[PDB]
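Replying to the earlier thread about multi-chain prediction with a worked example.

Input:
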Amino acid sequence: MQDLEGKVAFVTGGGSGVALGQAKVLAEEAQMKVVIADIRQDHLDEAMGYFSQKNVAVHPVRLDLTDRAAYAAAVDEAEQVFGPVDLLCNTAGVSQFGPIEKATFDDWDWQMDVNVNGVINGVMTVMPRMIERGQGGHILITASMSAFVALPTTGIYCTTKYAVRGLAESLRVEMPKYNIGVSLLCPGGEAVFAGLKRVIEHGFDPVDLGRVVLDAVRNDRFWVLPYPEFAEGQKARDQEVIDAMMSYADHPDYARRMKIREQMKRDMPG
Amino acid sequence: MQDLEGKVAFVTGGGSGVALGQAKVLAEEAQMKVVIADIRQDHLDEAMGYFSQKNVAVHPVRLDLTDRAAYAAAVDEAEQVFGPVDLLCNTAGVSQFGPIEKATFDDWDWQMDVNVNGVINGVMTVMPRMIERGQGGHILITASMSAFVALPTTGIYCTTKYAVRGLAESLRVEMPKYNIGVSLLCPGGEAVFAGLKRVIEHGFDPVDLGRVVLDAVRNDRFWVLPYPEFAEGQKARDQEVIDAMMSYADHPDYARRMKIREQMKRDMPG
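Result:
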């Protein structure tokens, strides 16, 4: 998405952490009009304490993303204060780790509701408005490297991040015909995976990651995975799947399905 | 898992389709005691019409998998009728396709509840009982190739199948120390992906897929992806991710993180 100056961003979880980092970069460098949406009033107040000392247009709104009615009201508010949302940053998220066999249903529901339904709720509130307006837009989903790597004690968290990865890849298919860009950011934050993870954890800065995001939005990049470390590890995970698929090769049902297409490759136009 | 004869299977959605195919193979060939759990009474009655003409031990229970209290009661019933569940087959699933921008919240909630919460509910009801009993077990999750491939109009469905894929890969990490095996089946059911898909769709038989499952359980295989076709297509999808990670290689932050580990590779034991 180009010419971000003066365009409107809606950033969830924007009162703290990664999302606040996104808000700062979008409001300050990119000069967007930014709405920060957060459930905690004290986090909002802290953020606005910062932004009140910068040349920015930032509007806070206290919002529980799991509340669909309130979400619609909050986006209405964004439109009244600034204008239609151009960039939606679904970045709010929570986590609590533990042995999966000790997880409670309350543990599941809380993390599922914020990490998955909160993202669904934003996408379904804003994306239809983008389409209706016909001026394009952009949707960012902040997942995690847990959308690629299951770890001990991260069972619930991993499930939620795989979910929104799926949603992101789904948006990626259907949004380009409406000139709506899609980005999927997967922060870090094998015993070797954890070790590589620890090194990025210590160099991670929310503003720095905010600039990675900014650059992805401008250039309309989908896979925002700024960790070349995880490549060789991911190649191994990938090869497992490929090998599993190929392990049924010699199994004659595959050879049958081969023969059908070879014939259909003949017989028909293209 | 070995010596399946006389052991107890709990098969969700077992009144019809893929799950019924699993139930038939487990009850007949493997000679397991099988509980088929289904929300529809007429599907149960149909299935038992079949099983009443076979030398099997099959017990029907009408169950809405989204009802946690009823799920616990249904598993209790399984234990009273046969004994503790040895094999849990989370196979029930629903689907409704359409443009993602036209999806309703009711559309989301229905598919999310059955496809994700239904699986979570089974896993959390049964797996802690398996651990407590200390005799091992096995957990099957039936997802879909939509856990790897986003398609037009399959946005909700894809999101749910990515989710349970994540859950499956998470179980895979934590269950082996309890001697509980995990399998992830991804049925079929690029314009080339759809074309390859259509060819398997037409050769798919629930009993045949049931035997693929049986073989995976016996040999404790995780990736049950019996389609070597999707390999080259999946390699391309994989390469996208690898390339994205590697695209930040020349970016000096990576070179910094390199240097830190090289030093930590020295300095310390292993």
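Chain A touches chain B through 76 residues (CB under 8 Å).

Feel free to reuse this layout for your own posts.
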